[PDB]
Design a binder for this molecule. Structure first.
Ligand SMILES: CCc1sc2ncnc(N[C@H](Cc3ccccc3)C(=O)O)c2c1-c1cccc2[nH]ccc12
Ligand SMILES: OC[C@H]1O[C@H](O[C@H]2[C@H](O)[C@@H](O)[C@@H](O)O[C@@H]2CO)[C@H](O)[C@@H](O)[C@@H]1O
Ligand code: NA
Length: 513
């Protein structure tokens, strides 16, 4: 389905895609291979959908946080640069694109948000979030505003949520989610108060913040290096500086490494490797991209040493040091989807902060909590003995849901025994190969009919039935993969329903005696 003897590249519409296209033409001049650069909308959502059918671009550019999901789903080629090429880029940039001990992409550039301020309106930018309300009252008296930034993407609000102790995954313990802790609450409450007190507008997006800053209407924005080009063109006298503190603590931006992955379905992997290693990741390659839209602190040592004298890059790295490198684990997609919704709902008043972050903590934890319950149930059903290990400090839900599933699922296996035996005989489950096939079937069976807990119990009960069979034919090793597939089916297709029901607390409530 992907065309051979050509390279299609996807990169986000805020990056230097014209610069990338020049590196494309320089690859074409020397090889006669034509490089097409596209910047589709929602490309981080559209990559997994199309790559999963063997389609999409040869090369996908995004921050590293989305690459573990892609690698887990088999969408990316392992990359195997020799040691002489590895030594040309900073090791911590390689760490960002290492997943299960394999390099799954090429690192390009280190991205961190900074505070961007109009030196003509605000010769001394605030050191603290707390002084922005008073500052805004002062600028409003002159027909200006203190601060506008994109409230539609959680990335821009995360530094403030994280300042007083909010976090995604404790360092990575995916059992420890920091989305609804007191630190997160205090950060998002301060944001909502800025909106309530009319210092910010809940509808402000990328375009509105950018235009307001570049036209000199607002004294400050929050943005990455890519934004500096449009500000150069604007003639705004701007500075790039350390983010304001919150409760005396630094803002901690989530740090992204812009990364180039190679489609597993691509029949041009050697051309892609040749383009990325010998044309893009060179002094002339990165300069071409950088001149269009700044990359930040580039992964390439030679060229990073030239750019590091720029005070805007120094400020970028200063914000990077105070932030955290994002996790690349497959949970990150769901974490971002949850926190985006929480910030938008808290900002608009659809939900309170406590409500919004409660829903976001449930969404971020949903996968791991589902798998915990389902894997424990399938294993104990297969072996006749429960798992002895602790459920966690935050897993009282997990223990109650498993108790409910045991009580309710007891009957479902017994009543549907004849029908389960038939369906199992109608499939040929014999090894890990056959378990792959089940997902399509379960999806299709879960794709029609009504969404309720009874049907979820029926699905998991068939899972346990299969786990028992797997154990009988010495395929015990296939139980965890089966449990992952049932979890994947359940979470990927019913996420929004499950968050609505308060996830597994809902399940325990619905069948309470
Ligand atoms: C992959 C097997 C799966 S996953 C699955 N997920 C939800 N519900 C299922 N079953 C009920 C239909 C049903 C009810 C009672 C008796 C028999 C069937 C439902 O869809 O509500 C199934 C089935 C399933 C299992 C065994 C026989 C089956 N016959 C059709 C589906 C199905
Ligand atoms: O808003 C969540 C979003 O944050 C990051 O995306 C950034 C990206 O890293 C930057 O390169 C820049 O383009 O802005 C984006 C935010 O709009 C994560 O990388 C992304 O996965 C996540 O969805
Ligand atoms: Na986007």
């Amino acid at each position: 389905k992907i065309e051979e003897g050509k390279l299609v590249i996807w990169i986000n519409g805020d990056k230097g895609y014209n610069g990338l296209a020049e590196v494309g033409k320089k690859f074409e001049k020397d090889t006669g291979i034509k490089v097409t650069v596209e910047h589709p909308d929602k490309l981080e959502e559209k990559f997994p959908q199309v790559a999963a059918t063997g389609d999409g671009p040869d090369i996908i550019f995004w921050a590293h946080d989305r690459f573990g999901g892609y690698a887990q789903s088999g969408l990316l080629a392992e990359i195997t640069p020799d040691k002489a090429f590895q030594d040309k880029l900073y090791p911590f940039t390689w760490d960002a694109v290492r997943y299960n001990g394999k390099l799954i992409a090429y690192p390009i550039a280190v991205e961190a948000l900074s505070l961007i301020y109009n030196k003509d309106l605000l010769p001394n930018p605030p050191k603290t979030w707390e002084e922005i309300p008073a500052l805004d009252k002062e600028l409003k008296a002159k027909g200006k505003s203190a601060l506008m930034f994109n409230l539609q993407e959680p990335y821009f609000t995360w530094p403030l949520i994280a300042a007083d102790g909010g976090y995604a995954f404790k360092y990575y313990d995916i059992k420890d989610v920091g989305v609804d802790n007191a630190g997160a609450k205090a950060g998002l409450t301060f944001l909502v108060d800025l909106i309530k007190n009319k210092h910010m507008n809940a509808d402000t997006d990328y375009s509105i913040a950018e235009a307001a800053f570049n036209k000199g209407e607002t004294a400050m924005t929050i943005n990455g290096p890519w934004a500096w080009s449009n500000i150069d063109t604007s003639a705004v006298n701007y500075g790039v500086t350390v983010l304001p503190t919150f409760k005396g603590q630094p803002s901690k931006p989530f740090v992204g490494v812009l990364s180039a992955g190679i489609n597993a379905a691509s029949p041009n992997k050697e051309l892609a490797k040749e383009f990325l290693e010998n044309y893009l990741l060179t002094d002339e390659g990165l300069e071409a991209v950088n001149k269009d839209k700044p990359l930040g602190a580039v992964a390439l040592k030679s060229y990073e040493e030239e750019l590091a004298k720029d005070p805007r890059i120094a400020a970028t790295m200063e914000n990077a040091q105070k932030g955290e490198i994002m996790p690349n684990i497959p949970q990150m997609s769901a974490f971002w989807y949850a926190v985006r919704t929480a910030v938008i709902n808290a900002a608009s008043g659809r939900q309170t902060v406590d409500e919004a972050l409660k829903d976001a903590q449930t969404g971020s934890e949903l996968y791991r909590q589902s798998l915990e319950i389902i894997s424990r149930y399938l294993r104990e059903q297969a072996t006749g003995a429960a798992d002895t290990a602790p459920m966690g400090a935050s897993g009282a839900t997990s223990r109650k849901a498993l108790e409910t599933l045991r009580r309710v699922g007891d009957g479902v296996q017994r009543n549907h025994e004849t029908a389960f035996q038939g369906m199992l005989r109608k499939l040929d489950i014999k090894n890990e190969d056959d378990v792959k096939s089940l997902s399509r079937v379960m999806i299709h069976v879960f794709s029609d009919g009504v969404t309720n807990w009874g049907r979820i119990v029926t699905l998991i009960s068939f899972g346990a039935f299969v786990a028992k069979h797997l154990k009988t034919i010495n395929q015990e090793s296939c139980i965890e993969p089966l449990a992952e597939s049932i979890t994947d089916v359940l979470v990927r297709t019913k996420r929004d329903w499950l968050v609505k029901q308060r996830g597994w607390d809902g399940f325990v409530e619905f069948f309470h005696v």
